Paper text:
We determined the structure of NTD of HpDnaB which is highly helical with a compact head (N-globe) and a long helix (H7) at the C-terminal end. The asymmetric unit consists of two complete monomers and two short peptide fragments. Interestingly, the two complete monomers form a dimer which is stabilized by the two short peptides and it eventually appears as a heterotetramer. In a dimer, the two monomers are arranged in a head-to-head manner where the C-terminal helices are extended parallel to each other. The electron density suggested that these peptide sequences are similar to helix 7 and MALDI (Matrix-Assisted Laser Desorption/Ionization) analysis of crystals confirmed that these are degraded peptides of helix 7 from NTD itself. The dimeric interface consists of 29 hydrophobic residues that bury 3410.56 Å2 of solvent accessible surface area. However, the NTD of HpDnaB construct has a half of the helix hairpin (Helix 7) which does not allow the formation of four helix bundle as seen in the structure of MtbDnaB.
To understand the roles played by NTD in helicase function, the importance of the linker region and helicase primase interactions, we present here the structure of NTD of HpDnaB at 2.2 Å resolution and compare it with other NTD structures.
Numbering used by the authors:
A (entry chain A): 1 to 122
B (entry chain C): 101 to 122
C (entry chain B): 1 to 123
D (entry chain D): 98 to 123
Write the structure that this text describes.
């Protein structure tokens, strides 16, 4: 895999984890013990997870209906990003995927910090 | 050095959390 | 400085700058404070700067994946021009380069106006 | 002593970051 295929696969993987939460709401818990919305590569994936956490906290089912209805307002999720999540194929055992999303996240934070540092050094 | 230190420290923590995970 | 070499240098400098932005997506604010897409010598680099500016306004990462996803698909950036940008070496401090890119843009605008003045005079 | 440590570290971070980038392409 070249770098491009990896980024494309991180995006795909996020969709699959989120799709699985829609099909099995209770997993939001095991996934959240590792991920925050901030850990998502594709921002709309983060806002989706952020809406789902909020729904779960109040015991409202996590589905297409409620994700849209309670969707922020000032911030929205594009139609295609929504469809692309709902349409992803749910797999069993997303432990690996969740781990790859977290790993990729730490890598990005390291990169941001690496930049900022060599930036303050002028 | 001020914010950078806090960013390196919190980054270091998000790191060891992945291991403390169990 | 050979004229050919110079031109090749301008093209090479634009990539290194764009490659630098891909390494630190935040550097796009600084670069944009001096450069518009139309200020790039090699058009595909300006088009790239354009898609990047758009991706940053949506807080979407500027990387190989999204650059290709956000490409107009009516108009596209030939793969060789992409690998050119992504493979170039991010430098440290692309300041001078940015001002160099801006300077050659101004020169070309100078030359263009020079021609319209000459042409529109020889009625 | 002093900021000698804040060079071994940063350089440590820069080496890890560079390692991850080199391991992503070419």
């Amino acid at each position: 895999m070249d770098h491009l295929k990896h980024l494309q696969q991180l995006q795909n993987i996020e969709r699959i984890v989120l799709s699985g939460i829609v099909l099995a709401n209770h997993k939001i818990e095991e996934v959240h013990s590792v991920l925050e919305p901030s850990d998502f590569y594709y921002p709309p994936n983060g806002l989706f997870f952020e809406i789902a956490l909020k729904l779960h906290e109040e015991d409202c089912p996590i589905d297409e209906n409620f994700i849209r209805q309670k969707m922020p307002k000032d911030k929205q999720i594009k139609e295609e990003d929504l469809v692309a999540i709902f349409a992803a194929s749910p797999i069993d055992n997303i432990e690996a995927y969740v781990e790859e999303i977290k790993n990729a996240s730490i890598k990005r934070k390291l990169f941001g910090l690496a930049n900022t540092i060599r930036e303050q050094a002028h | 050095i001020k914010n950078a230190s806090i960013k390196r420290k919190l980054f270091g923590l998000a790191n060891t959390i992945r291991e403390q995970a169990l």
